[PDB]
Amino acid sequence: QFLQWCTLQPENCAVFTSDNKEMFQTESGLVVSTYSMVANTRNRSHDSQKVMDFLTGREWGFIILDEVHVVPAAMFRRVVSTIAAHAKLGLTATLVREDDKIGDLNFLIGPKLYEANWMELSQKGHIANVQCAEVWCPMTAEFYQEYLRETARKRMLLYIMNPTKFQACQFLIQYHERRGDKIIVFSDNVYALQEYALKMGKPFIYGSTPQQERMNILQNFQYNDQINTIFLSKVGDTSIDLPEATCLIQISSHYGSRRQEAQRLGRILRAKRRNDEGFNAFFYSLVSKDTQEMYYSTKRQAFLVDQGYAFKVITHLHGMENIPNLAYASPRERRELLQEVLLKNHPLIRKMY
Amino acid sequence: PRKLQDLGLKPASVDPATIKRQKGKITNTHMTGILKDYSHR
Amino acid sequence: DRPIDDIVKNLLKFVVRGFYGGSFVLVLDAILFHSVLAEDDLKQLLSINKTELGPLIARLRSDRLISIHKQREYPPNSKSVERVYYYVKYPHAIDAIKWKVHQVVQRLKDDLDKNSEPNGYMCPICLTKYTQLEAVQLLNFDRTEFLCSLCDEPLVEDDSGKKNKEKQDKLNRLMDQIQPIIDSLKKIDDSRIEENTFEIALARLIPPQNQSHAAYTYNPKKGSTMFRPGDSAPATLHINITTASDEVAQRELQERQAEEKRKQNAVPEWHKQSTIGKTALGREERENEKTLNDYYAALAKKQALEDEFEDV
Ligand SMILES: [Mg+2]
Ligand SMILES: [Zn+2]
Incomplete structure (x- = not known):
């Protein structure tokens, strides 16, 4: 982005990530790094120790803290x-955190200079319009019974994998793919993410992924017409730009965090075709009824409501029954899945061997 | 050609000596033969 | 053939006809009429033997008016043989012609200068030439005759006194006879000639015979880093006429495309209406025309082999 928008010559730019650690030797240059590679204290490698000293020795003139929350x-x-600088800037779409440390920003980087409305930029064509929705997938009788007895930590995996959610996600994915939409399916839980992906034959990304493979997945999802949908995780929650993504679904969530909802919604707020007549991006939220998920769902969208977004309750998806094949339509498969998720908790002697 | 170029005659040839004759562990693999390499745009 | 190519060809023709014998004209004209021409084909075209083609090819090769190319050939039903091809490398031939023209004129000019100098001397017995300066240190004690050193015999004045005019006459003749070469070289310098190669020459080939044994092809070996000395040189348009019936058909297609585009953007159903009460989701004129035509007709009367291939 820095290269594309301004005349920054490539010679003066050095990217200090886990892959490459070379630093610009020209008098004045630019360093784009990450907190994990700069905030570490105990164990730094030899290759990463010279770079850190290079950062500390010089007196920088400007620091850009992306995602300053x-x-x-x-x-x-x-x-x-540690980093010496005469000017500090913070860039974040959401300025909220669960703890009381948000106010600490005042003496770290300074006050809040400017804020912008969400709906104002939406009606001016600068960001896309989204019809937020919250689908109520009633937990099937068989699964629900176990939800009563099980403890809190396993109950989560239980109400994330109810078959009705599989059917709703499968119906929405097919419906929007026919509409020529690029869909993203978020899930903070990795086991469900893999199970959904392998069941639907779609690529997925999560924390264990090497930087290149996820980059290859991202590029393919952008320009490859066959791969219309992917399955992201907590890694793609913030600061990943997909101008082609238009629809968005989430099957799991990180409790009551209000920010993750907004950051996830941001993936589709920059859709390329955000100015053609009548276009409306989509943000679905599948939640199991009569479960603790609704408690977190009504709590994790309290920030978007303040901005101006309104969530619409969807009890039933019209035309969902006539779809040819739905995942876990027979009780046999439902029973099999229930137990599957329930069970989750002398150099010469060298020749001898 | 050099000898012709010393007498002031343009040589229609050149000395042939000047003819310069010119990662690891992957995550998702159920997409075995789908991912086309769109490396550049 | 480019216009300059004709100029180069004419220059070669003039040089060969004027500065080489008769059979030389035949050999070079054959491979100027044709492009690269195999030795066997060259023999068959002129009906001369190997012992007679040898001297001709050798001399035209020493002067670099003809270039040679040897390559291994593998006939499908015979022992592999090495074939020899002959072609013309114009940059090479022109340089040889220019150098030789300059040298011949220079030699005659120098001979004119030398012949205009004092005569000299020679000894009749030992046939040793003495210059004017060298003879002046051998004259006898009487200062009457120049004596030789080895023979101790009087010296005799040398010749070349009268040739002062003949040598100038020779130069006057040569520049008149060699005029076309100078005129052709001037035009060649203005243009830029491309250096020729066996493969490049093959593009202008006129086959000599119906069934020549030599395969006039250049299939270089694969990944061969070997370099030999002096073997390197520096859509469819479719139109469619649209009739009136086609125009309305095209309009219908355009309307359909617009309808499909509108659908792609329209909102789904569940977002349209509030779905609270609904159940939860889960698993005859023709005769008239004729009588008119007859009526008007009455009026007007009243008034009056298997290989790999692709598709291109
Ligand atoms: Mg950003
Ligand atoms: Zn003598």
């Missing part, structure tokens, strides 16, 4: 002190 954490804030 994470700088007041226990250790990330240390970088703001």
Whole structure:
């Protein structure tokens, strides 16, 4: 982005990530790094130690803290002190955190200069319009019974994998794919993410993924017409730009965090065709009824409501029964899945061997 | 050609000596033969 | 053939006809009429033997008016043989012609200068030439005759005194006879000639015979880093006429495309209406025309082999 929008010559740019660690030797240059590679204290490798000294030795003139809602954490804030700079800027769409550390930003980087409305930019064509929805997938009788007895930590996996959610996700994916839409399916739970992906034969990304493979998946999802949908995870929650993505679904969630909902919605707020007549992006939220998920769902969209977004309750998807094949339509498969998820908890002697 | 170029005659040839004769562990693999390499745009 | 190619060809023809014998004209004209021409084909075209084609090819090769190319050939039903091809490398021939023209004129000019100098001397017995300066240190004690050193005999004045005019006459003749070469070289310098190669020459080939044994093809070996000395040189348009019936058909297609585009953007059903009460989701004129035509007709009367291939 830096190269494309301004005349920054490539020679003066050095990217300090886990892959490459070379630093610009020209008098004045640019360093784009990450907190994990700059906030570490105990164990730095030899290759990454020279670079850190290079960063610390020079007196920088400007620091850009992208996603500044994470700088007041226990250790990330240390970088703001170690790195010498005369100007500090913070860029974040959401300025909220569960703890009380948000106010700490005042003495770390300074006050809040400017804020912008969401609906104002939406009606001016700068960001896309989204019809937020919340689908109520009533838990099937068989699964629900176990939800009563099981403890809190396993109950989560139980109400994330109810078959009705599989059917709703499968119906929506097929319906929107026919509409020529690029869909993203978020899930903070990795086991469900893999199960959904392998069941629907679609690529997925999660934390264990090497940087290149997820990059290859991202590029394919952007330009390959056959791969219309992917399956992201908590890694893609923020700061990943997909101008082609238009629809968005989520099957799991990180409890009551209001920010993750907004950051996830951001993936589709920049859809390319956000100015053609009548276009409306989509953000679905599949939640199991009569479960603790509704408690978190009504709580994790309290920030979008303040901005102006309104969630619409969808009890039933019209035309969902006539779809040819639905996952776990027979009780046999439902029973099999229930147990499957329930069970989740002398150099010469060298020749001898 | 060099000898012709010393007498002031344009040589229609050149000395042939000047003819310069010119990662690891993957995550998802159920997409075995689907991912086309769109590396550049 | 480019216009300059004709100029080069004419220059070669003039040089061969004027500065080489008769059979030389035949050999070079054969491979100027044709492009690269195999030795066997060259023999068959002129009906001369190997012992007679040898001297001709050798001399035309020493002067670089003809280039040679040897390559291994593998006939499908015979022992592999090495074939020899002959062609013309125009940059090479022109340089040889230019150098030789310059040298011949220079030699005659120098001979004119030398012949205009004092005569000299020679000894009749030992046939040793003495210059004017060298003879002046051998004259006898009487200062009457120049004596030789080896023979101790009087010296005799040398010749070349009268040739002062003949050598100038020779130069006057040569520049008149060699005029076309100078005129052709001037035009060649203005243009830029491309260096020729066996493969390049094959593009202008006129086959000599119906069933020549030599395969006039250049299939270079694969990944061969070997370099030999002096073997390198520097859509469809479719139109469619649209009739009136086709125009309305095209309009219908355009309307259908617009309808499909509108659908792609329209909102789904569940987002349209509030779905609370609905159940939860889960598993005859023709005769008239004729009588008119007859009526008007009455009026007007009243008034008056298996291989790999692709598709291109
Ligand atoms: Mg950003
Ligand atoms: Zn003598």
